[PDB]
Ligand code: NA
């Protein structure tokens with residue numbers, strides 16, 4: 001009744017390749033809040049700003065016991081470079097096959113260039129300690145976004 005999105009059950013057991021060489025799964029994050037932010041491409045201005053914004057707010061997320069995951073379809077090596085360059089203290093998911101993206105339905109289509117063009121739409125989600133998607137932001141505007149996500153988390157966690 002509180003879920004704004006229903007994920008296929010298998011989503012929670014998908015092995016998610018992380019920056020740094022390990023994997024996680026959504027089920028492995030049971031027991032705490034999880035912020036999942038999707039962005040199209042490593043190292044672009046918008047995505048760097050978004051990542052730096054979350055990073056700067058990390059202690060506030062820590063206060064709530066929450067964890068952050070950034071997600072794009074870039075490689076682990078790209079993610080490692082991006083993370084090292086920017087100093088991110090949270091992991092990035094290398095969703096190269098877009099399995100996680102599809103589960104969250106963030107692969108959106110646009111009729112452009114006389115074609116049907118599919119791409120990651122910047123989107124963010126809040127997953128409860130019990131794995132429910134309780135809030136979604138789509139077609140995300142970077143400015144003020146991380147602040148808004150934090151506020152929403154604090155409202156939901158209470
Ligand atoms: Na993978």
Ligand code: NA
Nearest residue numbers: 029034128129
């Ligand atoms: Na969770």
